[PDB]
Amino acid sequence: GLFGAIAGFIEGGWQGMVDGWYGYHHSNEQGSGYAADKESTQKAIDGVTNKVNSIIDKMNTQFEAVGREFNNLERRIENLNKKMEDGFLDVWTYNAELLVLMENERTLDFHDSNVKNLYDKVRLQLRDNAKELGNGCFEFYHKCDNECMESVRNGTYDYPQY
Amino acid sequence: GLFGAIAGFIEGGWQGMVDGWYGYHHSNEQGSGYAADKESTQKAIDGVTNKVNSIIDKMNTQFEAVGREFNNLERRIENLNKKMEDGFLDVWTYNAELLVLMENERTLDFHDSNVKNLYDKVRLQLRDNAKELGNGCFEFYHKCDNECMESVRNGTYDYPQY
Amino acid sequence: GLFGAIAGFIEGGWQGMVDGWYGYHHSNEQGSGYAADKESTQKAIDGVTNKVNSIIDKMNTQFEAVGREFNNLERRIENLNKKMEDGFLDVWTYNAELLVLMENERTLDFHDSNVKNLYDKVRLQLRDNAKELGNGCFEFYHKCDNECMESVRNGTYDYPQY
Amino acid sequence: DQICIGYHANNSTEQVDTIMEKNVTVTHAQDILEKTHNGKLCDLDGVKPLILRDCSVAGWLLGNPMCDEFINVPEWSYIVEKANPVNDLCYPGDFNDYEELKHLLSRINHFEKIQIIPKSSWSSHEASLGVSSACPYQGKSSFFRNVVWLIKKNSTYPTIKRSYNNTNQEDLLVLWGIHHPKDAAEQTKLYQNPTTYISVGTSTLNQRLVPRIATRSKVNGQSGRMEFFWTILKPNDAINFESNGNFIAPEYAYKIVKKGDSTIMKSELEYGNCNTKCQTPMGAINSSMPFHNIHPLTIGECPKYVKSNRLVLATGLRNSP
Amino acid sequence: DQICIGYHANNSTEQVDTIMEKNVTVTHAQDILEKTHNGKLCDLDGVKPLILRDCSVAGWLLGNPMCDEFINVPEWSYIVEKANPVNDLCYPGDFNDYEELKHLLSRINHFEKIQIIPKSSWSSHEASLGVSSACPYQGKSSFFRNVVWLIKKNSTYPTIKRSYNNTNQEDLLVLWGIHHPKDAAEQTKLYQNPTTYISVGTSTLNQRLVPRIATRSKVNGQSGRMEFFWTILKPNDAINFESNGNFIAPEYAYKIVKKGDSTIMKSELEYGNCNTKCQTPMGAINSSMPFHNIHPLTIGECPKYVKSNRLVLATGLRNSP
Amino acid sequence: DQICIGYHANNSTEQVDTIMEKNVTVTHAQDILEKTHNGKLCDLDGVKPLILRDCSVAGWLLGNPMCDEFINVPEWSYIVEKANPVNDLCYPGDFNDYEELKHLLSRINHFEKIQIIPKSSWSSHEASLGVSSACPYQGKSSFFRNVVWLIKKNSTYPTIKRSYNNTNQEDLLVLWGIHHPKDAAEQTKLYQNPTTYISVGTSTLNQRLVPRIATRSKVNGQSGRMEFFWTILKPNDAINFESNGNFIAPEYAYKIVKKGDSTIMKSELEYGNCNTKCQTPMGAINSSMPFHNIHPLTIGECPKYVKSNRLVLATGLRNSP
Ligand SMILES: *[C@@H]1O[C@H](CO)[C@@H](O[C@@H]2O[C@H](CO)[C@@H](O[C@H]3O[C@H](CO[C@H]4O[C@H](CO)[C@@H](O)[C@H](O)[C@@H]4O)[C@@H](O)[C@H](O[C@@H]4O[C@H](CO)[C@@H](O)[C@H](O)[C@@H]4O)[C@@H]3O)[C@H](O)[C@H]2NC(C)=O)[C@H](O)[C@H]1NC(C)=O
Ligand SMILES: *[C@@H]1O[C@H](CO)[C@@H](O[C@@H]2O[C@H](CO)[C@@H](O[C@H]3O[C@H](CO[C@H]4O[C@H](CO)[C@@H](O)[C@H](O)[C@@H]4O)[C@@H](O)[C@H](O[C@@H]4O[C@H](CO)[C@@H](O)[C@H](O)[C@@H]4O)[C@@H]3O)[C@H](O)[C@H]2NC(C)=O)[C@H](O)[C@H]1NC(C)=O
Ligand SMILES: *[C@@H]1O[C@H](CO)[C@@H](O[C@@H]2O[C@H](CO)[C@@H](O[C@H]3O[C@H](CO[C@H]4O[C@H](CO)[C@@H](O)[C@H](O)[C@@H]4O)[C@@H](O)[C@H](O[C@@H]4O[C@H](CO)[C@@H](O)[C@H](O)[C@@H]4O)[C@@H]3O)[C@H](O)[C@H]2NC(C)=O)[C@H](O)[C@H]1NC(C)=O
Ligand SMILES: *[C@H]1O[C@H](CO)[C@@H](O[C@@H]2O[C@H](CO)[C@@H](O[C@@H]3O[C@H](CO)[C@@H](O)[C@H](O)[C@@H]3O)[C@H](O)[C@H]2NC(C)=O)[C@H](O)[C@H]1NC(C)=O
Ligand SMILES: *[C@H]1O[C@H](CO)[C@@H](O[C@@H]2O[C@H](CO)[C@@H](O[C@@H]3O[C@H](CO)[C@@H](O)[C@H](O)[C@@H]3O)[C@H](O)[C@H]2NC(C)=O)[C@H](O)[C@H]1NC(C)=O
Ligand SMILES: *[C@H]1O[C@H](CO)[C@@H](O[C@@H]2O[C@H](CO)[C@@H](O[C@@H]3O[C@H](CO)[C@@H](O)[C@H](O)[C@@H]3O)[C@H](O)[C@H]2NC(C)=O)[C@H](O)[C@H]1NC(C)=O
Ligand SMILES: *[C@@H]1O[C@H](CO)[C@@H](O[C@@H]2O[C@H](CO)[C@@H](O)[C@H](O)[C@H]2NC(C)=O)[C@H](O)[C@H]1NC(C)=O
Ligand SMILES: *[C@@H]1O[C@H](CO)[C@@H](O[C@@H]2O[C@H](CO)[C@@H](O)[C@H](O)[C@H]2NC(C)=O)[C@H](O)[C@H]1NC(C)=O
Ligand SMILES: *[C@@H]1O[C@H](CO)[C@@H](O[C@@H]2O[C@H](CO)[C@@H](O)[C@H](O)[C@H]2NC(C)=O)[C@H](O)[C@H]1NC(C)=O
Ligand SMILES: *[C@@H]1O[C@H](CO)[C@@H](O)[C@H](O)[C@H]1NC(C)=O
Ligand SMILES: *[C@@H]1O[C@H](CO)[C@@H](O)[C@H](O)[C@H]1NC(C)=O
Ligand SMILES: *[C@@H]1O[C@H](CO)[C@@H](O)[C@H](O)[C@H]1NC(C)=O
Ligand SMILES: *[C@@H]1O[C@H](CO)[C@@H](O)[C@H](O)[C@H]1NC(C)=O
Ligand SMILES: *[C@@H]1O[C@H](CO)[C@@H](O)[C@H](O)[C@H]1NC(C)=O
Ligand SMILES: *[C@@H]1O[C@H](CO)[C@@H](O)[C@H](O)[C@H]1NC(C)=O
């Protein structure tokens, strides 16, 4: 992806994280587990939902064909009528297929971007209080219990305290 | 935004920075203030200006309707003529509205990108001679007077000197 | 570019790197030289190739003009026929020219992105075993012979070993 | 101790296409193209279509005796006509401006047949012997039920001078005809007068027809022809007739009581005993999708027709193998 | 001590839409859709339009006596005609190929009326008694000023055989007509000869009209009708006339002195005493925008018409609350 | 010791355009618009076109004696006709429904001329004196080779009653005509009978023509005119003729042996002794590009026509100065 996170420095997704699109996984003496990041997930849902409706809505005004019949010595205008009706179908077919392709690409990159940004958000808190492992994970120098872990998910990770 | 800077790790813009789109704010013993980054700002102006004209210019060649009248037993070709004129208006209306939507999105992301790049430019100079605070700011380990500050805006920040 | 690498923090390309789009340059006691990164290069080739064919293929279904003649008292439908044929040419001309513009922009940014990602890939391995110079280069703290250099291109750079 | 950043994955096999890559597996997708239909012709929003079956629009309106099913049809939503209806013009001929009239029906939902010139009112001409073996009914020779093939009575066809006044509020579709006999003998045999005409006039109309006599190829055993004409008689306007012979006079005409959204749909399918909000010549559509690829000619609140085989938007993200 | 990176903000409330988000507040924007007009019909680039007012193109060209304002009109930029002009054909009838002629006017900016067959030159027929109460002028019976309703003189209508040669450099629009009387009595009363015709020929034209006699609905007190015809007589070509009666002969015809960009615009508005470079049926446009949503039928150097209510491009960046 | 990350550069001067920037130099590009052609008219896939040269479609089909080159032309791929062919109708007149017929030829690749009514079979009328100085051949007066201008024999033109039956498998294009003489004298001089007609009938056709006599402008020395008509006689159907005079009878008619993809192409160019898979009125195209900007009217397996001057996709990346 353009932003390098999804299927990049983060090698794969998590079957275990069910209640969100992006989030955290922690490991310490007390245990381990997944937690969805609500804010970035809801951001993603709102964006993709608005996109779909934007797509559906733009295509709502579009050419409609009507029945028109012509006799045996009106072949020219019959042909004109056929070329006209067909011409617009090709135009709208192209429009629809291209929009889907282009926006699918943008949708995938958007998810890549949200993950990258979430990762940087955490990196910018932890700073030099943890080893950046190169795979989406941060190894702490201090021990980090569930309150400590929660404080990272918060945004409240008290850097000077550690 | 896709690049994470605008309304992201940089929480908001500056009312106080009037003479540019992107720039710096400094704080030291001598005082504080804003300075626009000329190069990236002019880059932004050139890009957006070319885009607008590119948009205006592509739409310049576009369907024009003509007056065409038909009698009471030419209803079929009157209808054809109506469906044809309307068909093209819908096509160009769609084209125009979609281009504006798509390019507006790209324009906002472009500004996000320019800010992110400016931020990284400074980060790559200061390296480990300053604390990356996580909000767009860098706190120096040494004192940094206005010449020092200017040298960062320059690109000339003499890293080894500090 | 949007991703800041090409003609950004990496100031220019390399005439000397002939066998790939992206890669590495090393300098140590034994010598120096270029090596293409195969994986990201082939990724780039596959993407751009699929794009071109996607473009060519979408435009394959498109309006075709036919010969239609009218007499001296069929001027209205002659004009209709002319406006119809021309109308579709303008639509497809616009479609083609706009697609090329938009996708050219995306293609250039895609290359920028692949370079940025390659750079981050290396940065995330070396971590604090090298000075990030700010111009695409990493200066090692330890000596790094050709096996060491190769191990960085590998992905296998044994960080703890150094 | 560590904290990791990551993203969702699942067992989804849904694929989407992009510009640079095809068949990308994603966690979630949304199909937006309706590909299925019910294969039936149905009531449109409660209102049954007029299904002409083996009759054509001409056979129906002129009242071809094989088309009595449609002697008085109620209000319709759309009309369905076969590609080559067998029961068209039982006596061979032409229908003047047939397509312009068909186009008029796409703006009409309901007719009311009324009698403008009674059959019993033709006291100087023979009105009950205008029948042909080309138009059989129940084993016997018959004729278009809505028009009267008038012939000579006791060897005299005196000049007809009739007028009807549209006293109704509603526009009135009127139909008449001219007979083009096979030879000079039949002309005198049926109408006496060797040279004849039909002159028709309204506020806008200024017509004057003359029969063209000629021997022609036999169709349904007939060498003669019938050329049919029509007009829309506005409210409070009057139609004038005048003829020496060959006049196919109106008996019934149709009141246009309801206008609006309609269409003539060409299809071989019959009635489906069925209801829908979107109908196509191949079947009806029941979906909330913004697109379909069934058929371009639809009627009702429908999705937009495209020629695609597949339209699927990505909602989720790239799913891991 | 610190240095921060940041971006501009201001008091802007301008909003723009994107695919994923609507009503995004930005620091700077650029509207590209012209929504306003001046509500007037104006000179196009100094050149005033022909405003037919209550006359139609037929009333004007045939010279309906209620349309003397347009007896000799100068060069125009565009033409303006009402939806239902009251002064069309004062004597009821038809105008043959009327729409093909109207279409011809969209390529014409200037006519010059010239006399091809003088009224005083009809020495064997009566030329000054061709008037009707259907075409009143100043309380009196009159007639289309550009054509001559010729009737019998001292109970004889001898065969007319006239010819005009287009000696001018410029194409010549010629107009004539045929009278369709109400009955056999009027035919002889006006023209003597019971059976008549008008034969017209040029290099390309091979016409021969015959009056259709019939009693019709009365319009402006008339049961008879006038069917008008036209042609473009090329330079150095000649038009031949021949008739027994019912001939509505040309007196004046129009020289086509200037061709080019023009249009017939349908509008109820009158002259605005005004100037513009872009005109629409609802008003004129003065803007540098690439788009507008006023009306599709424009003339002049205009923005491109779209159906949008709003087109606003973002120039600046997302503005902070 | 160090390791650097970087990207390719080269000596490329190829430029591409984007939305925000024009003339961006890139390492690699791909042109997708064909701008060149060979300037010739060529065989389409081995099958030579019919190049009418100085003849028109009318001159060819009616058999204008200046158009003997096309007396029997083999199967063609497309047809080429000049903008204003000099050899059209040698005797002046009209060709009825000419454009509808031309449109029919776009679906036809091969005709076979056959004799339906022999010239020697006209035993009661003169058939070998129907010639004009307007249609010269080899210094002498001649006439359209496919039709017979029948005139009176020993001062009698008796009624013609002929019939032809299409016994062939293939649709048959039939052509005939009517003569419109200059005056009453010529009518009797050529045909005796003062009042005449031509009545034509098939299963679908019900025609009856009458000559319009009038003095007209002289074209190729002729004041009279010839109005030509046509029909498609279906298999196993028969065409009936009947006339008093002025009949231009068919001798030859064309069998429609092959239908399919064809076109009438308007061009002043002649044959190029050449082969191609894509032809345009200005020249042929040999390329694998998805687009071209030569001309919109093409025939064959062609690239798609756009109005662009330039379409170049970026493949490589931004090239360093
Ligand atoms: C088919 O039939 C209908 C009638 O069945 C024909 O229309 C009728 O035509 C006759 C004349 O032939 C008209 O006669 C009278 O018209 C009005 C009637 O009253 C008017 O005002 C009332 C007021 O509410 C209104 O309801 C009516 O609609 C109408 O507007 C009389 O005024 C008129 O007499 C006039 O007196 C004036 C002063 O005394 C004079 O200045 C006038 O010159 C005039 O003499 C006359 O007696 C019918 O009105 C008319 N009916 C309708 C409904 O139109 C119709 O024409 C026919 N078809 C054809 C083709 O002819
Ligand atoms: C309406 O009126 C105009 C005239 O008012 C008609 O056109 C005219 O038709 C007459 C014949 O009816 C022609 O007569 C003479 O034509 C030319 C004139 O000179 C030629 O060369 C000069 C040189 O500059 C040039 O200006 C002229 O335009 C023209 O090209 C004579 O040569 C010709 O005599 C010929 O002599 C030759 C050798 O002696 C012979 O081989 C020829 O056979 C021929 O006898 C003749 O006397 C007019 O030229 C012509 N005028 C114009 C302007 O066209 C017009 O036809 C009419 N309408 C209709 C429908 O008829
Ligand atoms: C131009 O010419 C052709 C002939 O050259 C005309 O068509 C022909 O029209 C005649 C009548 O005028 C028909 O005569 C006979 O038709 C059939 C022939 O046999 C049938 O079955 C065979 C079986 O293989 C098949 O090959 C034939 O195609 C055809 O289907 C006879 O059956 C028929 O006799 C019938 O006998 C029945 C029982 O005894 C009766 O119920 C019937 O009423 C009828 O009497 C008759 O003798 C030709 O068939 C027909 N030929 C073709 C090829 O169509 C053509 O009409 C003419 N043009 C015009 C405009 O008229
Ligand atoms: C996000 O998470 C952090 C870390 O868990 C939160 O800080 C913790 O908040 C809890 C619950 O409010 C505090 O519990 C309190 O303890 C005191 C006694 O110490 C007691 O008086 C209260 O009744 C309550 O039980 C806890 O002290 C605190 N711990 C730490 C290390 O900060 C924080 O509140 C969260 N912040 C946001 C913005 O979500
Ligand atoms: C960008 O800014 C840096 C930092 O301010 C610039 O360096 C400074 O440039 C000034 C003005 O040229 C120098 O002033 C000079 O001082 C010497 C004596 O020391 C005097 O001989 C000259 O007449 C002049 O006044 C100053 O020394 C210098 N200071 C430092 C710390 O570098 C730099 O020139 C700028 N570079 C670019 C590329 O814009
Ligand atoms: C990528 O490159 C690294 C660094 O060069 C590779 O490690 C090196 O691989 C070579 C070739 O396989 C090894 O050579 C072997 O040496 C041993 C004796 O030490 C000998 O028994 C074998 O016959 C062979 O010659 C070398 O030891 C090794 N060096 C280091 C420092 O790791 C690595 O294999 C590559 N990995 C990938 C995934 O491409
Ligand atoms: C992407 O997937 C589609 C659908 O699975 C592939 O199309 C099918 O290919 C199979 C195997 O060759 C054929 O048997 C089917 O007829 C195809 N079905 C349809 C609906 O097209 C397609 O080939 C794949 N595309 C790419 C580029 O890999
Ligand atoms: C975005 O803003 C527009 C314009 O301010 C909103 O449309 C208006 O909504 C108000 C409040 O409901 C209505 O009274 C007006 O009639 C609307 N005006 C126009 C011009 O549309 C719109 O609802 C907003 N859209 C979204 C998605 O929030
Ligand atoms: C980008 O380059 C094109 C082509 O090189 C430029 O167009 C040419 O400009 C030259 C110099 O003025 C003219 O003489 C030619 O007539 C132009 N050729 C063509 C094919 O257009 C163009 O001006 C450049 N565009 C920009 C924005 O710099
Ligand atoms: C995929 O997993 C879901 C759990 O949400 C389960 O309901 C479903 O049965 C699974 N489907 C397949 C095909 O394995
Ligand atoms: C349409 O489909 C839905 C299920 O998607 C079904 O429940 C409903 O009854 C259908 N509506 C009609 C009118 O048949
Ligand atoms: C916004 O600020 C500008 C300063 O550039 C000022 O001129 C203007 O009055 C302000 N507008 C509003 C609505 O406050
Ligand atoms: C058009 O508008 C401008 C202001 O934008 C005005 O100054 C000018 O006079 C106008 N032009 C005309 C021709 O009315
Ligand atoms: C560019 O370099 C290539 C090497 O691939 C060489 O073949 C070519 O001659 C060079 N072209 C120019 C114009 O210098
Ligand atoms: C078309 O061009 C190719 C070269 O691109 C040439 O070799 C070939 O012979 C040409 N084909 C024809 C049919 O002329």
UniProtKB/TrEMBL annotation, chains D, E, F:
Q: How does it sit in the membrane?
A: Single-pass type I membrane protein
- Which molecular function term from Gene Ontology is one that the record holds? host cell surface receptor binding
Positions of glycan attachment: 11, 23, 154, 165, 286
Ordered alphabetically, the record's keywords are: Clathrin- and caveolin-independent endocytosis of virus by host, Clathrin-mediated endocytosis of virus by host, Coiled coil, Disulfide bond, Fusion of virus membrane with host endosomal membrane, Fusion of virus membrane with host membrane, Glycoprotein, Hemagglutinin, Host cell membrane, Host membrane, Host-virus interaction, Lipoprotein, Membrane, Palmitate, Transmembrane, Transmembrane helix, Viral attachment to host cell, Viral envelope protein, Viral penetration into host cytoplasm, Virion, Virus endocytosis by host, Virus entry into host cell
Which biological process, per GO, is one annotated for this protein?
Answer: fusion of virus membrane with host plasma membrane
S-S bridge residues: 42-274, 55-67, 90-135, 278-302
Q: What is its main location?
A: host cell
In which compartments does the protein localize?
A: Host apical cell membrane; Virion membrane
Instruction: Output a single Gene Ontology CC term carried by this record.
Output: viral envelope
Function (record text): Binds to sialic acid-containing receptors on the cell surface, bringing about the attachment of the virus particle to the cell. This attachment induces virion internalization of about two third of the virus particles through clathrin-dependent endocytosis and about one third through a clathrin- and caveolin-independent pathway. Plays a major role in the determination of host range restriction and virulence. Class I viral fusion protein.
Which family does the entry's similarity section mention? Belongs to the influenza viruses hemagglutinin family.
Q: How does it assemble?
A: Homotrimer of disulfide-linked HA1-HA2.
* Name of the molecule in the record: Hemagglutinin
Q: Which organism is it from?
A: Influenza A virus
**Lineage, broadest ranks:** Viruses, Riboviria, Orthornavirae, Negarnaviricota, Polyploviricotina
Designated gene of the protein? HA
Please state which portion of the whole protein this structure contains, as first and last residue out of the total length.
17 to 337 of 565
